[PDB]
Symmetry: D2
Subunit: 287 residues, 4 copies
């Protein structure tokens, strides 16, 4: 009663953002979507057209309660940060107040203080090249959009959160062990993120009593996964064959964990990387 | 319903076992206590004399419910392991079916299959001596009671548990980083426990579809903690001053995490060490 | 006989770069210095003036053999990457061929193929602000100069290295555990670096048979350490008081390890973070 | 000179003990072998009959030098620990001073203080059974012989060692990640060993100025490796195909690392697990 969560990084219903939204809904948490401008209008259209009606069903009792849907770009911290090419762009020209500070302000102006924050987004222009062939521009882009965006989101959203609020992001084990196709500095971005989760936990915990953790998810066939070089088909087959738990990993499996970590039940957990991957991370040798 | 939990390692209401019991009770889980014979009688008398009535209060809306109390010694796998001296000992003479196998059979005969199992016990004859000064007997004692007991509980209880059951144990960071005062091969035992948790997640996940995880708890002033000599006041004071979250760590804080890991909501987590310690583990240098 | 090492990141003799140069010298490795342009001329002047003569003494037998000293800026991958403000800058206008590709070319043109590479440099414009107050520009700068620079150096220098060559960089435990004054995204930069060391180890090992590792050094009172917010005086006092080995950490302590990892003796070690810190990293609770 | 190393765990020339001996010999270190009584006689006869002559060749410039060969059983701390049956056993009846304390005293009486100590031994009665199926006796046997033996060697040998001495042992990644086939509580034992290495680095560093580290070696086809059942050919084949460095892992590869960690050149390293495994440990998914 009175819980609000902003979920940054929803493009459709096949990702972890949706799975997190669903499980939170089971707890009656009011959901707000942060949607990347290039895919905002298409998302809105699909929604209006009922494409997601089946995916919104929680069970016999209720449908997902989406409070709001807002364009959100993690590339830009403030209004001042947008360049001419973006201002003049087909998809952006028709929207506004989609930088991180603007979204924080706008949510606060519409619904007040919130208490749950979800970072569920990543990007890397050069993800299809291996680390050794990644440019400076490509590397920094991955860190900017996949790691720095977490820090920015915290800096701006903490002003509009209640004490004892909770924050999560999503990571991948490629930060810790070598995953060949996970290129473009995504492995690097994820390494920074897991470390940043610790440092942030210190500052937010001491200064605001706010917790932050990260979930290291197993493979899910989402939009962005399909962008990597079959990679995702391999990851999923391998996981289902060699993980300790031979079960299909679902986005709601991550969602049920996200929900717990965002609740008061996990009051004593902060700065952690929690693995939700059917135990795959524990294996050395495939058997 | 049909949720039954066996909690192995309860002697009073001051430890993590009680905190886990209270939190599980809040979710309507049936609780069965396994009590070490040296303190079983004192436990029962206190209970009967209503000495724990206060401690069983949940909401003031609700009160803890305990299905059964059973004598239990995690030193003994089967009846045939019990040495003549122990079986005739003043505190054991009067008790029956207290080995790991017998307690498994007993519970199964009385209530059928269970779906939740808690290892919440440790012991070490030589905990007061630092590692270098620990004898072979002392070290092996510590591993036998604090680590092997977990593997044995698993071997015998997996026959009385349903698929998708969950198992948790409790550990301490001294396994990964040096804590002077944590002697006797206790650090050794917790390191083995945390490694055995992975190995067992493999076997139990593939063969039985059963999860196992361990919680690395922060300092609580329990009965056993005081037996370390003072050490625990130091640990508590240090934790409350330097942890990211500066709040008093409660037994029920661990309880609610335990409860989550035991429920179906952590379906995709297995073989992990989950830290519930106000984030202290993430720190390097104090302030 | 015939070993050449390029050391990127020498400003004076109080850092780890110098300590590495010294120990390598003991093995008769030919040393080449990569010196950051802003401090190139001052370094050259001090050298010419004999300020380092005492610091170059190895022992009774010999003086350090410096093959060459070159301006080197890790901010720039190629000639194309330099902007007008830098081209027009007091200290830069008077030098050339100081981008990473130019240095690789120039060394190769002068001395041929080399077999030992050392990354011993970091920078972060906003190091004095905590992570939460660090800007995008500040964060990315730290990653650009402290982490991406390693990848670039490998991409360009592998063309001019022999099979079985070896590469190292320097890191700090702040990537793994929270160190309060280590701000500006340096903790983040170091986290990316340790992870990048793994990914690089894969690519360089499979494609070129080249090894790469990173040394996680304890505190040394160097130029850059003095830039952090007494921090370094605290770090050193604490380390000398609480590390398992109560001895002054010397730059040559790191140098002797760097030397081993750059030699054939460590033929089977790659992608590792090796701690050289008098064991400090193993402690949880100060005693 | 005055460098003397005791190597505990040698039965033939096919293990890591021999490889460590050869590498130490190359540095003019005096070698003393501690040989388990069940294979001591067979070892001596082979040696005397010149069966190891080939294996002792270093450069063809040089040949291994062995100061002494001693019967040694790491099961027994002192003479008073030896059970009547063992002392009268056919293979033990003829031997004397083979406990940890007696071998320490003996070496001290014969050669004075030593500065290098190698634990290169492990055993487990039930290694063929997976963890879940390991008995209490088997598990405790594995910890007693493979882990406790290290602590005991330390306690008794620290009296016959000089300050700035160094101690190494050998471990395997199955402590940290799951390796099916590594049964008997061997994984448990290696996890305890790796934790005890930190705890002992603390005590030994502060009280004696003595270092201790452990090497996590990749697969070598030793005598003991074949006793696991095949398991080791599998491990080797997997390692040579998937490791960053695709070259055959040799015993002397471990030897040279051991030699570095035992020398004064690793003065600032203590309590670490150093991986010498062609970088396999850093990988997540194969190709
Ligand atoms: N899918 C997997 O297998 C997997 C495994 C581990 C971790 N993850 C992580 O989970 C998170 C969610 O991704 P997903 O797997 O659900 O795929 P997804 O495509 O559903 O989610 C990624 C979202 O990030 C958004 N995004 C990209 N750039 C952005 C920017 N600059 N500003 C704002 N939004 C931007 C995209 O619109 C997209 O909706 C990611 O951080 C990913 O790294 C995914
Ligand atoms: N209290 C802390 O600070 C702390 C921190 C980390 C982990 N832990 C862990 O939590 C668990 C419980 O300890 P606690 O702190 O709650 O103290 P506690 O005394 O409340 O719990 C220990 C219980 O284990 C029982 N026990 C001991 N040996 C037994 C045997 N052979 N068979 C059956 N039962 C036996 C004892 O009777 C006792 O009731 C332990 O595993 C401990 O390692 C405690
Ligand atoms: N000193 C410590 O306590 C400590 C502890 C752990 C790690 N380290 C690491 O050791 C490495 C060496 O630093 P140090 O401690 O010897 O101090 P240092 O100042 O002697 O070395 C840092 C060098 O990096 C150079 N540099 C900065 N920006 C550069 C750029 N854009 N291009 C090229 N060079 C640039 C500087 O000129 C300087 O000489 C650093 O990576 C540091 O992070 C230091
Ligand atoms: N070979 C590998 O693949 C591998 C990989 C990682 C670690 N290791 C480790 O290396 C060490 C040596 O094993 P190895 O692979 O060289 O096989 P090995 O047979 O060459 O070494 C084992 C030696 O230990 C001796 N030993 C056993 N019990 C003893 C006791 N109670 N007292 C004294 N000596 C005893 C045996 O006689 C044998 O000579 C072990 O600790 C093992 O765990 C080996
Ligand atoms: O199965 C592993 C896996 C699949 C998808 C992932 O998400 C991304 C990967 C790359 C990029 Cl550019 C963006 C995103 Cl959202 C991910 O992190 C890990
Ligand atoms: O605050 C840290 C801490 C306190 C108590 C603990 O529990 C024990 C410690 C020693 C022994 Cl012999 C038995 C137990 Cl139950 C523990 O594991 C960690
Ligand atoms: O004692 C810990 C410590 C001291 C100095 C360090 O090096 C730097 C720190 C910050 C910046 Cl901007 C640049 C460099 Cl070279 C470092 O990494 C860690
Ligand atoms: O290739 C991995 C590997 C092979 C052999 C090993 O050594 C032993 C394994 C089991 C037992 Cl009973 C005794 C020893 Cl010496 C080991 O530790 C790891």
């Amino acid at each position: 009663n009175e819980d609000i969560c902003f979920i940054a990084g929803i493009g459709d219903t096949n990702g972890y953002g949706w799975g997190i939204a669903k499980e939170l809904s089971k707890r009656n948490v009011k959901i707000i979507f942060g949607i990347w401008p290039p895919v905002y209008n298409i998302f809105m259209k699909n929604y209006k057209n009922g494409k997601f009606d089946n995916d919104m069903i929680i069970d016999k009792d209720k449908k997902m309660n989406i409070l709001d849907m807002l364009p959100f770009d993690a590339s830009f911290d403030t209004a001042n940060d947008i360049d001419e090419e973006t201002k003049n762009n087909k998809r952006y020209n028709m929207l506004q107040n989609y930088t991180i500070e603007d979204v924080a302000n706008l949510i606060h102006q519409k619904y007040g203080k919130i208490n749950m924050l979800v970072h569920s987004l990543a990007n890397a222009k050069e993800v299809q090249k291996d680390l050794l062939n990644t440019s400076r521009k490509g590397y920094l882009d991955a860190l900017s959009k996949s790691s720095y965006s977490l820090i920015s989101l915290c800096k701006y959203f903490v002003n509009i959160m209640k004490p004892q609020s909770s924050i999560i992001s999503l990571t991948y084990h490629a930060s810790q062990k070598v995953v060949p196709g996970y290129g473009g500095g995504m492995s690097s971005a994820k390494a920074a993120l897991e470390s940043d989760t610790r440092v942030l936990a210190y500052h937010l915990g001491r200064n605001y009593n706010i917790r932050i953790n990260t979930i290291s998810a197993g493979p899910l066939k989402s939009r962005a996964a399909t962008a990597i070089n079959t990679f995702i088909d391999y990851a999923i087959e391998y996981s289902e064959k060699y993980a300790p738990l031979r079960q299909k990993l679902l986005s709601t499996d991550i969602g049920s964990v996200a929900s717990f970590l965002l609740s008061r039940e996990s009051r004593a957990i902060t700065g952690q990387t929690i693995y939700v991957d059917n135990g795959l991370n524990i294996m050395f040798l495939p058997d």
